[PDB]
Write a protein that binds this ligand. Structure first.
Ligand code: ADP
Ligand code: ADP
Ligand code: MG
Ligand code: MG
Lengths: 343, 323
């Protein structure tokens, strides 16, 4: 061995909510933070079946704080992008479990803001602290819905963008818009406009956002004179992904979710198996995040109630598979696509 | 009735002349056209030419625009229609000049004060009619509404809806105005309040939307008509962009206009588009003023404005007397 890297997988179980309490659902999910374990009871108990237990890199219970999640699990990933790695954070699980609460949270609120806005603060504070380093940060924001890509930052919300792929390039979204951002205020405003554009259709956003994938992309370039006196540029891409609801697995089947499951499963079956990246826009776009040149963290969001036990178990099984995925991340050094080369 | 669209091109300024920029915008009042030429000329490339309801060059005076374009709109509000006039275009092109103008020279007064004069002189001449005129003044900045007339400038107001009359700004202050002097005072009060909290007033006013609202009730079977006149001065208007001019209300405005002219209209997506819902495809007459500058330096933004304005001409409204 040479001192590759596993996809990091964490589970977060949200509090039982008022609707669930009012319906008298039982709490069947138990989280053991010390052991990094989640146990799921059968709603009929051991009179029917024994409980299922899973182990993860870390687990977070109903009392987990947004900022502690951040510092323990997400910060090192963001750190890596600040040093020129590609990094991906994705939230997976059933509608209503807390993917968006985890990814976006309550912006403007330091206690309740999620990983995206925490990453903004981390990134720009890091930049302002640095010396003898030049940074350029820019953001894109896109939605995948019905296997088409919509640029949430574009003035034209009717156009759909195509994925292209070259040996020079890797896969990329052709003609995707990007905003250069110099501060937290600027990148927050980028997210505001994308979120506003996201609702351009009639279907209520609760339903629409459940049925689509949102990907916020922070590209961080850094230029610094090395000990060899040469100007070295590194470029890392931080993909921050809030997936469609995991229950959506004919038109009810989300093809990017289904492809994601097959990719995860193929990557960990222990065989030389075909990995079907091309079977969806999501898995094509995130190909490096799943077996490739990136560091990746998966947050598997679940809720505690007996009523949702089946979807919870589905989530936990995929999460348990994903933790065996091996990536091979590298610092992305002096790439041809670097805007900082202009200066 | 279609949204009326006019273009106004300001004079070349001193800095532009000093930098030796070419004048690339030509205006033909006879054809109602504006032409953007290549400095290399027609042996190289043809000008981009657009047609509008009216066009006004750098020499056109405030009162020419008023009597030709704005007056019929204000006439309609005096007859019980909703009417809207909005100024759109690049920062520095003349939106504010057109809407507010400059007080000290009567000839330089913009559509807002000119409308005051027209409305109150009309009312003073009226036989067999009773008018009541009310004014409100608000700003939209960062998708929040500030009442420019309230004492507390830290408060923000929500939009609510009534089942018959539609959207309104909850708790917005409204002054009854009996004269030009009273309504001008309301404008002066609001324009003072606008700079409250601004780090740079010119940048702030370029990034926000100002909406002066005149509600004209007329009593004259007993008829009561009510028409709302919205007078709007908008924010300035891999694909790499800069985050600093992001304007959430303008984004929404674009999506609304696109959906209206394509052959769901997302009015609810922003404060501006909810307030302007009637003005854009609804129960109002509407005039758009597309402001542009003449210099070669700004040509791409000028063209973007003209294309935007060209599309807006296609919006179909359904104005009724509100009786
Ligand atoms: N850890 C948590 N603590 C408190 N409230 C939460 C938590 N996770 C989710 N919620 C709440 O539950 C609701 C559903 O969460 P959301 O993130 O929208 O679900 P989805 O997984 O569908 O995006 C929201 O009202 C959100 O505030
Ligand atoms: N038609 C015009 N004639 C003369 N000066 C003008 C005209 N339009 C604008 N200006 C002047 O040009 C400058 C910028 O105009 P302004 O209305 O402030 O632009 P905007 O509101 O579009 O940013 C101001 O000094 C203004 O008085
Ligand atoms: Mg969600
Ligand atoms: Mg102005």
């Amino acid at each position: 061995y040479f001192q590759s890297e596993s996809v990091r997988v964490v589970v977060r179980c949200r509090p039982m909510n008022g609707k669930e309490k009012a319906a008298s659902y039982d709490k069947v999910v138990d989280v053991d933070v010390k052991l990094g374990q989640v146990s799921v009871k059968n709603p009929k108990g051991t009179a029917h079946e024994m409980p299922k237990t899973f182990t993860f890199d870390a687990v977070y219970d109903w009392n987990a704080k947004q900022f502690e999640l951040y510092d323990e699990t997400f910060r090192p990933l963001v750190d890596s992008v600040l040093q020129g790695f590609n990094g991906t954070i994705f939230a997976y699980g059933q509608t209503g479990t807390g993917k968006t609460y985890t990814m976006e949270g309550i912006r403007g609120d330091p206690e309740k803001r999620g990983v995206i806005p925490n990453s903004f603060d981390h990134i720009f504070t890091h930049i302002s602290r640095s010396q003898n380093q030049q940074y350029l940060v820019r953001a894109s924001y896109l939605e995948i819905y019905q296997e088409e890509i919509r640029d949430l930052l574009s003035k034209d919300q009717t156009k759909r963008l195509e994925l292209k792929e070259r040996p020079d390039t890797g896969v990329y979204v052709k003609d995707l818009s990007s905003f250069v951002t110099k501060s937290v205020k600027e990148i927050e405003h980028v997210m505001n406009v994308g979120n506003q554009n996201r609702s351009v259709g009639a279907t209520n956003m609760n339903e629409h956002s459940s049925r689509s994938h949102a990907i916020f992309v922070i590209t961080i370039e850094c230029s610094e004179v090395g000990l060899d006196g040469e100007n070295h540029i590194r470029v890392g891409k931080l993909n921050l992904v809030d997936l469609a609801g995991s229950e959506r697995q004919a038109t009810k089947i989300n093809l990017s979710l289904s492809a994601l499951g097959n990719v995860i499963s193929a990557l960990v079956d222990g065989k030389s198996t075909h990995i079907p990246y091309r079977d969806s826009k999501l898995t094509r776009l995130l190909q490096d995040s799943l077996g490739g040149n990136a560091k990746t963290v998966m947050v598997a969001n679940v809720g505690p109630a007996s009523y949702n036990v089946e979807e919870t178990l589905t989530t936990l099984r995929y999460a348990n598979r994903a933790k065996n995925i091996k990536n091979k991340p590298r610092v992305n050094e002096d790439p041809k696509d670097a805007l900082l080369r202009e200066f």
